[PDB]
Amino acid sequence: LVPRGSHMAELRPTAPPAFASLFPPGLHAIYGECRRLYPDQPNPLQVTAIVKYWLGGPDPLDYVSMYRNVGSPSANIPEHWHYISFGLSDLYGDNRVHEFTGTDGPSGFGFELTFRLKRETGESAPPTWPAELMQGLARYVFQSENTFCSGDHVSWHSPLDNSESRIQHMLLTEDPQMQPVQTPFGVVTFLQIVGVCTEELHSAQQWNGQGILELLRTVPIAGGPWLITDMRRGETIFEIDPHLQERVDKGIETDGSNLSGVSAKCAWDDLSRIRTRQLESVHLKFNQESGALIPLCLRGRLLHGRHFTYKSITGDMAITFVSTGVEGAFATEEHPYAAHGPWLQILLTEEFVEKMLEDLEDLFKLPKEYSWPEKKLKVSILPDVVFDS
Amino acid sequence: RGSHMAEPTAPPAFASLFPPGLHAIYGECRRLYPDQPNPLQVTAIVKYWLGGPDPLDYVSMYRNVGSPSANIPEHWHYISFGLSDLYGDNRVHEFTGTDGPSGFGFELTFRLKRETGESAPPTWPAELMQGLARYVFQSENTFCSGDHVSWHSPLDNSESRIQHMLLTEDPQMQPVQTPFGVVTFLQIVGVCTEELHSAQQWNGQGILELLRTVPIAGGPWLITDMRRGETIFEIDPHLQERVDKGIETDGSNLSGVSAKCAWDDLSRTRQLESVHLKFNQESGALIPLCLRGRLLHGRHFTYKSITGDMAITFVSTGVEGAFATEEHPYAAHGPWLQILLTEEFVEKMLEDLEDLEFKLPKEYSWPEKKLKVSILPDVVFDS
């Protein structure tokens, strides 16, 4: 039989913008991607800086395009407003704001901010507050020269739209739609701002940024695969799902912690009986909050050959936990407890911290005391009254 | 008959112990000071990469006899270790390889005039160097020869008039090549608010070169005397004439200033046919700089009100993003006024405006341009 043929049972830019000569080449490329995504909105609402930054203006971003993304409620992606900045990258390439660096490497700071705000009902246009937020974030970047990555966190400690909204902080990720572009003035990637609660910010600091991001992609209400910020969100991802906390802690064990130290209630005392002092025995003290970080300090820092420092909020006192892999420590295996004044350094071997972690479970009859006489070490978790005196 | 003329080398002890980055720097130290192989040092016992507040691991303190023979006093010389990649093992700085800058690409130095009674180098500048290093580590801003640091505090915690810093290349220390990159040596030079202000108005390099001609400031090697009382302009009045000569030739690094100033119209962005600009004696004094050292150089200048929203930005013909053109030279976006002035016209203005005592309110008017500039008493802007 001669082939009858296939019968498919299931099937699912290129033209320059008006008046191209007018556009700066760096602005021209970014706009190209925006058109790719939104051909139906060729003239979107824009917030624009009339007083230019290079002429005294407070606003580093020259433009903020505001499109309407329908999303895919067909696949749990809500309707939202999409915000795209112009100014963080080298737009003009004439050394007015950014140093011209040519095609190789990053255009300006090498990125432009984006943000996806979940659309409410009655909203017949995109709200203009996130534009001002982006301006604010751009000020941070311009005043220093701290270029941001996918995974970075920003401590804002203020409701992003000045609302009562829980969402007071921001994480940064790759925009799910925007593809990095090559301008004549360098390369531009697209960092998306994702709003988060103080609690979730702390989780990213404790673990890593990328991991907390991935966690938000499985919680649509937060959340979603496209990381859309809903300002009217009331509960954290941990309150929506307590099972997630386990994946945070599991990750701290797997990847390690970004947390190098913490200002908390802590103290240490000598049992031996400025210059370095080598202590034969030591007694470390913590409240419930700082004591709760001990497993993180051991499992996610020392077990990874990194270190951890507890600083007492009141006073001179400090404790630094160190592993064998650290360089420049004045605490060695032979003299594992050493202090330069009030600053205590404790060296703990890999074999021994594993044994400690067997004793230390969550982490409540306080004082909760632990003791290893073979190491001459005592760790006690006390009520806050001790350190408040 | 013939002519009748009238007129490191070895490695240090236990070299294997030293990290390669620390080696090259110490090599340059030994070159200058072979007679002081073990100088006094401030050392960070608690390290920065382990929680320590001090970014500099070491600060060497040598004794330079100088050359009073040729007007160089005796002084203490301070050399930092930590700003550049010392260990090249990614604990503090990213290992970038031999090409480009090691760490931040520099270490700090400082030269303090030796007093009498001082039989040892004072330790305070070490803490000053730690302090400056924190600035550099928190914001990864790299300093250059010519930069200024607004410290707003007497450097040695004295009541001393030396409250600020400029930065220059060290006159003795030559740049070194480490296996982790290149290290230059930036010398901290202590200055007064008056001198800091001049460098902002002109450039650092200019005020630096000016200090080399005043030994007490000063000196060819830029040695900080903390006991200095009079500014370089008080020791030499002619030097004030030397700065603006440069501001004219080179330009100005001053882009704007918060001051008492206001504007009015005589009649998105409204364009104005006539305009009245108002300044106090202090801000009005900057006008020549604003014109001569910014506008005549294709650059802009902004006056902002210390009180309120009002602002005035002067622009020239060679600026982008302005909304004031030649055809409509006075335009405002709300309380922010932009005045466009041409090269030909500012030359004519400068002929009209002198200095800029005592004749307030001093007024200036160009009817063919519909422009009034008045210098008023400070009471006007206060209400």
Short mmCIF file of C-alpha atoms in Angstrom, two decimals, chain A:
data_model
loop_
_atom_site.label_atom_id
_atom_site.label_comp_id
_atom_site.label_asym_id
_atom_site.label_seq_id
_atom_site.Cartn_x
_atom_site.Cartn_y
_atom_site.Cartn_z
CA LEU A 1 0.00 0.00 0.00
CA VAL A 2 1.29 3.44 -1.05
CA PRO A 3 1.65 5.69 2.06
CA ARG A 4 -1.64 7.45 2.91
CA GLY A 5 0.29 10.24 4.65
CA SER A 6 0.34 11.65 8.17
CA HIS A 7 -2.82 13.12 9.71
CA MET A 8 -1.86 15.41 12.60
CA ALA A 9 -4.58 14.87 15.21
CA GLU A 10 -3.41 17.76 17.42
CA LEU A 11 -1.84 21.12 16.58
CA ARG A 12 -1.24 23.80 19.25
CA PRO A 13 9.71 41.77 15.48
CA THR A 14 11.18 41.50 11.91
CA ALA A 15 9.82 45.01 11.09
CA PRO A 16 11.51 48.08 12.64
CA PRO A 17 9.53 50.49 14.86
CA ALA A 18 8.20 53.84 13.60
CA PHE A 19 11.04 56.38 13.24
CA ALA A 20 14.04 54.23 14.15
CA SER A 21 16.83 56.81 13.62
CA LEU A 22 15.41 58.64 16.64
CA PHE A 23 16.04 55.79 19.10
CA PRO A 24 19.29 55.30 21.03
CA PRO A 25 20.67 51.85 20.05
CA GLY A 26 20.57 50.46 23.62
CA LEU A 27 16.95 51.49 24.12
CA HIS A 28 16.21 50.06 20.67
CA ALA A 29 17.20 46.50 21.63
CA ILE A 30 15.26 46.31 24.92
CA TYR A 31 12.15 47.64 23.17
CA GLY A 32 12.67 44.87 20.61
CA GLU A 33 12.10 42.17 23.23
CA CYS A 34 9.09 44.04 24.64
CA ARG A 35 7.50 44.10 21.20
CA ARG A 36 8.28 40.40 20.79
CA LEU A 37 6.26 39.67 23.94
CA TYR A 38 3.52 42.28 23.42
CA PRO A 39 2.79 42.97 19.74
CA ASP A 40 -0.77 44.03 20.64
CA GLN A 41 0.42 46.88 22.91
CA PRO A 42 2.73 48.98 20.71
CA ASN A 43 2.24 52.15 22.77
CA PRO A 44 1.95 51.05 26.43
CA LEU A 45 1.55 53.41 29.37
CA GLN A 46 4.92 54.77 30.45
CA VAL A 47 6.31 56.58 33.45
CA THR A 48 9.07 58.87 32.19
CA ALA A 49 11.73 61.11 33.74
CA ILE A 50 11.42 64.67 32.41
CA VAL A 51 14.34 65.86 34.52
CA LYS A 52 17.25 63.64 33.45
CA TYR A 53 19.54 61.90 35.95
CA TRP A 54 22.69 63.11 34.21
CA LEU A 55 21.34 66.66 34.53
CA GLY A 56 20.52 66.58 38.26
CA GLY A 57 17.41 64.38 38.26
CA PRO A 58 16.58 62.08 41.21
CA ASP A 59 15.35 59.33 38.87
CA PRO A 60 18.04 57.15 37.20
CA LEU A 61 15.48 55.27 35.10
CA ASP A 62 14.51 57.24 32.00
CA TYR A 63 11.46 55.13 31.17
CA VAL A 64 9.24 52.49 32.73
CA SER A 65 7.05 50.67 30.20
CA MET A 66 3.86 49.14 31.66
CA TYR A 67 2.28 46.30 29.68
CA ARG A 68 -0.65 43.95 30.34
CA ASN A 69 0.13 40.23 30.44
CA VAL A 70 -2.94 37.98 30.26
CA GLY A 71 -0.90 35.16 31.81
CA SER A 72 -2.27 31.63 31.72
CA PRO A 73 -5.04 30.85 34.23
CA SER A 74 -5.34 27.85 31.88
CA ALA A 75 -2.12 26.74 33.62
CA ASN A 76 -2.32 28.71 36.91
CA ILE A 77 -0.64 31.99 35.86
CA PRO A 78 -2.83 34.94 36.89
CA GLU A 79 -3.42 38.14 34.93
CA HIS A 80 -0.82 40.73 35.91
CA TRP A 81 0.82 44.03 35.02
CA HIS A 82 4.36 43.82 33.64
CA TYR A 83 6.90 46.58 34.34
CA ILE A 84 10.16 47.05 32.40
CA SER A 85 12.86 49.62 33.25
CA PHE A 86 15.07 51.69 30.94
CA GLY A 87 18.16 53.34 32.41
CA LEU A 88 20.14 50.72 34.33
CA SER A 89 21.78 49.58 31.08
CA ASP A 90 23.74 51.75 28.66
CA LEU A 91 21.00 53.17 26.43
CA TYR A 92 22.67 56.03 24.58
CA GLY A 93 26.28 54.81 24.58
CA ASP A 94 27.70 58.35 24.55
CA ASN A 95 29.29 58.30 28.05
CA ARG A 96 26.64 60.54 29.67
CA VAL A 97 25.61 58.10 32.45
CA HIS A 98 27.48 54.85 31.84
CA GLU A 99 31.02 54.36 30.62
CA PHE A 100 30.92 53.06 27.05
CA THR A 101 32.47 49.59 27.20
CA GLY A 102 31.70 48.31 23.67
CA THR A 103 29.89 45.11 22.65
CA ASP A 104 31.93 42.77 24.89
CA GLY A 105 30.68 42.32 28.46
CA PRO A 106 27.84 44.10 30.30
CA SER A 107 25.92 47.09 28.95
CA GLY A 108 26.09 49.57 31.84
CA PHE A 109 25.21 47.58 34.94
CA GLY A 110 24.33 44.75 32.55
CA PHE A 111 20.65 44.44 33.45
CA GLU A 112 17.29 46.22 33.59
CA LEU A 113 14.71 45.66 36.31
CA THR A 114 11.34 44.03 35.66
CA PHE A 115 8.36 43.45 37.98
CA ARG A 116 5.09 41.50 37.73
CA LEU A 117 2.23 42.81 39.85
CA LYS A 118 -0.92 40.69 40.06
CA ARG A 119 -3.88 42.56 38.56
CA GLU A 120 -6.82 43.29 40.86
CA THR A 121 -10.40 43.84 39.69
CA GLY A 122 -11.38 47.39 38.76
CA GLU A 123 -7.77 48.04 37.77
CA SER A 124 -8.24 49.22 34.19
CA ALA A 125 -4.62 50.41 33.91
CA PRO A 126 -1.32 49.41 35.58
CA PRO A 127 -0.69 51.19 38.93
CA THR A 128 2.27 53.58 38.86
CA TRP A 129 3.76 52.85 42.30
CA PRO A 130 6.08 50.01 41.17
CA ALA A 131 7.69 52.47 38.75
CA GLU A 132 8.65 54.59 41.75
CA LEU A 133 9.86 51.45 43.54
CA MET A 134 12.13 50.65 40.59
CA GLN A 135 13.42 54.23 40.64
CA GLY A 136 14.18 53.71 44.34
CA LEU A 137 15.97 50.43 43.74
CA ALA A 138 17.93 52.04 40.89
CA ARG A 139 19.16 54.70 43.33
CA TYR A 140 20.74 51.96 45.50
CA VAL A 141 22.54 50.56 42.46
CA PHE A 142 23.76 53.93 41.16
CA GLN A 143 24.97 55.38 44.49
CA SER A 144 27.15 52.33 45.09
CA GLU A 145 28.20 50.12 42.18
CA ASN A 146 26.73 46.87 43.54
CA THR A 147 25.52 44.99 40.47
CA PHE A 148 22.77 42.51 41.33
CA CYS A 149 22.44 38.84 40.35
CA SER A 150 19.64 36.34 39.97
CA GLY A 151 19.24 35.14 43.57
CA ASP A 152 20.18 38.34 45.42
CA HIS A 153 17.94 39.73 48.16
CA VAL A 154 17.08 43.33 49.03
CA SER A 155 16.20 44.40 52.58
CA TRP A 156 13.51 47.04 52.08
CA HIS A 157 11.81 46.78 55.51
CA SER A 158 8.81 48.72 54.21
CA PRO A 159 5.56 47.80 52.41
CA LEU A 160 6.50 48.10 48.72
CA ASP A 161 3.44 50.20 47.80
CA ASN A 162 3.29 51.84 51.26
CA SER A 163 0.26 49.61 51.85
CA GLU A 164 -0.20 47.66 55.05
CA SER A 165 0.76 44.65 52.90
CA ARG A 166 2.92 41.96 54.49
CA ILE A 167 5.23 42.12 51.44
CA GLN A 168 8.08 44.37 52.63
CA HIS A 169 11.08 42.83 50.86
CA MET A 170 12.37 41.78 47.42
CA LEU A 171 14.18 38.88 45.79
CA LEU A 172 15.77 39.00 42.32
CA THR A 173 15.46 36.40 39.54
CA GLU A 174 15.65 35.96 35.76
CA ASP A 175 12.49 37.22 34.03
CA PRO A 176 10.66 34.08 32.75
CA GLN A 177 9.78 35.70 29.41
CA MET A 178 12.50 38.27 28.62
CA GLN A 179 15.50 36.94 26.72
CA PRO A 180 18.90 38.60 27.33
CA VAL A 181 19.81 40.98 24.49
CA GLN A 182 23.00 42.12 22.74
CA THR A 183 23.18 45.89 22.15
CA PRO A 184 26.05 47.74 20.46
CA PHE A 185 26.93 48.92 23.98
CA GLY A 186 27.04 45.49 25.64
CA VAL A 187 24.79 42.75 27.01
CA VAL A 188 21.50 43.26 28.88
CA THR A 189 19.88 40.61 31.07
CA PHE A 190 16.54 41.04 32.84
CA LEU A 191 16.24 40.88 36.63
CA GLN A 192 12.74 40.43 37.98
CA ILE A 193 11.79 41.84 41.37
CA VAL A 194 9.78 39.41 43.49
CA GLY A 195 8.10 40.71 46.64
CA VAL A 196 8.52 38.70 49.86
CA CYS A 197 7.65 38.79 53.58
CA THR A 198 10.34 39.44 56.24
CA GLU A 199 10.16 35.73 57.13
CA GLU A 200 10.86 34.62 53.55
CA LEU A 201 13.74 37.10 53.26
CA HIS A 202 15.32 35.52 56.34
CA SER A 203 14.95 32.07 54.76
CA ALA A 204 16.89 33.13 51.65
CA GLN A 205 19.65 34.62 53.80
CA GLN A 206 19.83 31.41 55.87
CA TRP A 207 19.79 29.08 52.87
CA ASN A 208 20.30 30.61 49.40
CA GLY A 209 18.23 32.98 47.26
CA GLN A 210 17.75 30.59 44.34
CA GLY A 211 16.25 27.90 46.59
CA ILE A 212 13.59 30.12 48.18
CA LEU A 213 12.73 31.34 44.67
CA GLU A 214 12.21 27.77 43.44
CA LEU A 215 9.96 27.20 46.47
CA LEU A 216 7.74 30.15 45.50
CA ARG A 217 7.23 28.64 42.03
CA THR A 218 5.24 25.78 43.57
CA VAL A 219 2.97 28.08 45.61
CA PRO A 220 0.73 29.92 43.07
CA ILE A 221 -0.86 32.29 45.64
CA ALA A 222 2.60 33.75 46.42
CA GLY A 223 4.14 32.97 43.98
CA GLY A 224 3.55 30.98 40.79
CA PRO A 225 5.99 29.69 38.12
CA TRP A 226 6.35 33.27 36.81
CA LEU A 227 6.83 34.77 40.29
CA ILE A 228 3.98 37.27 40.27
CA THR A 229 3.75 39.56 43.29
CA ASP A 230 0.33 39.78 44.95
CA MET A 231 0.40 42.63 47.46
CA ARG A 232 -2.85 41.47 49.08
CA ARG A 233 -1.19 38.22 50.19
CA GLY A 234 -1.68 37.58 53.92
CA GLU A 235 0.14 34.34 54.79
CA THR A 236 3.77 33.30 54.21
CA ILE A 237 4.65 30.20 52.16
CA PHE A 238 5.45 28.50 55.49
CA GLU A 239 1.94 29.21 56.79
CA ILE A 240 0.39 28.07 53.51
CA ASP A 241 2.55 24.92 53.72
CA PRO A 242 4.52 23.94 56.86
CA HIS A 243 6.03 21.02 54.88
CA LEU A 244 8.21 23.55 53.01
CA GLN A 245 10.25 24.45 56.11
CA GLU A 246 11.72 20.92 55.89
CA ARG A 247 12.91 21.58 52.32
CA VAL A 248 14.53 24.81 53.52
CA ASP A 249 16.45 22.96 56.25
CA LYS A 250 17.26 20.02 53.94
CA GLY A 251 18.71 22.54 51.48
CA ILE A 252 20.87 24.17 54.16
CA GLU A 253 22.34 20.69 54.68
CA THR A 254 22.73 20.06 50.94
CA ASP A 255 23.97 23.41 49.57
CA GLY A 256 25.07 25.09 52.81
CA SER A 257 24.21 28.45 54.36
CA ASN A 258 24.80 31.97 53.08
CA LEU A 259 24.56 33.14 56.70
CA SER A 260 28.00 34.00 58.06
CA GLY A 261 26.89 35.54 61.35
CA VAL A 262 24.12 37.11 63.40
CA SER A 263 23.59 39.76 66.06
CA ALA A 264 21.75 37.97 68.86
CA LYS A 265 21.75 37.31 72.61
CA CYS A 266 24.86 35.26 73.42
CA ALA A 267 27.73 34.97 75.90
CA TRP A 268 30.67 32.74 76.85
CA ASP A 269 32.57 32.00 80.05
CA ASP A 270 35.96 30.53 80.94
CA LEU A 271 36.29 27.53 83.24
CA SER A 272 40.11 27.45 82.94
CA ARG A 273 40.50 29.82 85.94
CA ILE A 274 45.00 42.63 74.44
CA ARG A 275 46.55 39.16 74.18
CA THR A 276 45.23 35.79 73.01
CA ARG A 277 44.05 33.43 75.72
CA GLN A 278 43.95 29.67 75.32
CA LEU A 279 41.09 28.27 77.38
CA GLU A 280 41.15 24.69 78.65
CA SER A 281 37.38 24.71 79.06
CA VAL A 282 34.52 26.93 77.95
CA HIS A 283 30.78 27.50 78.49
CA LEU A 284 28.65 28.96 75.68
CA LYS A 285 25.27 30.61 76.26
CA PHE A 286 22.32 31.45 74.00
CA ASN A 287 18.65 32.45 74.17
CA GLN A 288 15.95 30.41 72.37
CA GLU A 289 16.18 32.52 69.19
CA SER A 290 19.98 32.45 68.77
CA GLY A 291 20.10 28.87 70.05
CA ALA A 292 17.73 27.93 67.23
CA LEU A 293 20.46 28.89 64.73
CA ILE A 294 22.98 26.39 66.16
CA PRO A 295 21.95 23.50 63.86
CA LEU A 296 22.26 25.89 60.89
CA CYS A 297 25.64 27.05 62.25
CA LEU A 298 26.85 23.43 62.44
CA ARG A 299 25.01 21.60 59.63
CA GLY A 300 25.22 24.40 57.05
CA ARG A 301 28.45 26.21 57.91
CA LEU A 302 30.99 24.12 59.81
CA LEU A 303 30.08 20.91 57.98
CA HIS A 304 30.79 22.85 54.79
CA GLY A 305 34.19 24.06 55.99
CA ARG A 306 32.84 27.58 56.47
CA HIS A 307 32.46 29.55 59.73
CA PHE A 308 29.83 31.29 61.88
CA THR A 309 29.90 34.28 64.25
CA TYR A 310 27.49 35.11 67.05
CA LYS A 311 27.66 38.76 68.17
CA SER A 312 26.00 39.89 71.42
CA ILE A 313 23.62 42.80 70.74
CA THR A 314 24.66 44.26 74.09
CA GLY A 315 28.42 44.61 74.57
CA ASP A 316 31.86 43.45 73.45
CA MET A 317 31.25 39.68 73.52
CA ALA A 318 31.45 37.53 70.37
CA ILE A 319 31.67 33.81 69.55
CA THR A 320 33.03 32.50 66.24
CA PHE A 321 32.55 28.84 65.38
CA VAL A 322 35.22 27.54 62.99
CA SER A 323 35.99 24.33 61.11
CA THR A 324 39.37 22.77 60.25
CA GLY A 325 39.33 24.21 56.71
CA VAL A 326 39.41 27.88 57.75
CA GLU A 327 42.61 29.93 57.37
CA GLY A 328 43.77 32.60 59.82
CA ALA A 329 41.96 31.19 62.83
CA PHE A 330 43.82 31.45 66.13
CA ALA A 331 41.92 28.42 67.40
CA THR A 332 43.51 25.11 66.39
CA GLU A 333 42.66 21.45 67.10
CA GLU A 334 45.29 21.38 69.86
CA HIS A 335 43.90 24.51 71.52
CA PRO A 336 40.30 24.58 70.21
CA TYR A 337 39.15 27.36 72.55
CA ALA A 338 40.91 30.69 72.16
CA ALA A 339 39.89 34.29 72.77
CA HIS A 340 41.28 37.64 71.70
CA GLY A 341 39.75 39.69 74.50
CA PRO A 342 35.97 39.08 74.53
CA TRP A 343 36.05 37.45 71.07
CA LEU A 344 35.94 33.66 71.44
CA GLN A 345 36.95 31.29 68.65
CA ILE A 346 35.91 27.68 68.93
CA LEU A 347 37.35 25.04 66.61
CA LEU A 348 35.16 21.94 66.17
CA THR A 349 36.11 18.87 64.10
CA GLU A 350 33.83 17.23 61.52
CA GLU A 351 33.59 14.01 63.56
CA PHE A 352 32.62 15.92 66.72
CA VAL A 353 29.97 18.27 65.29
CA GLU A 354 28.11 15.18 63.98
CA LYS A 355 28.02 13.89 67.57
CA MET A 356 26.78 17.28 68.81
CA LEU A 357 24.01 17.28 66.20
CA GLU A 358 22.87 13.90 67.54
CA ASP A 359 22.48 15.51 70.99
CA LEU A 360 21.00 18.77 69.66
CA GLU A 361 17.39 18.24 68.59
CA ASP A 362 15.07 21.23 68.01
CA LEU A 363 16.42 23.69 68.90
CA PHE A 364 10.53 23.75 76.24
CA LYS A 365 12.09 23.26 79.69
CA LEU A 366 14.66 26.06 80.01
CA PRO A 367 17.48 26.28 81.02
CA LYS A 368 18.27 23.52 78.51
CA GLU A 369 21.84 22.41 79.20
CA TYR A 370 24.27 20.30 77.16
CA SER A 371 27.72 19.13 78.26
CA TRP A 372 30.64 17.21 76.74
CA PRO A 373 33.19 16.66 79.56
CA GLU A 374 35.56 14.89 77.15
CA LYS A 375 35.85 18.21 75.26
CA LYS A 376 35.33 20.42 78.34
CA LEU A 377 32.44 22.19 76.60
CA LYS A 378 29.04 23.34 77.87
CA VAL A 379 26.26 24.81 75.73
CA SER A 380 23.20 26.17 77.53
CA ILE A 381 20.02 27.67 76.08
CA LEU A 382 18.53 30.15 78.53
CA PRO A 383 15.63 32.62 78.86
CA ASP A 384 16.29 36.19 77.66
CA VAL A 385 16.37 37.58 81.23
CA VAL A 386 20.00 36.42 81.59
CA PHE A 387 21.25 38.65 78.76
CA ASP A 388 18.90 41.47 79.81
CA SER A 389 21.04 41.87 82.94
#
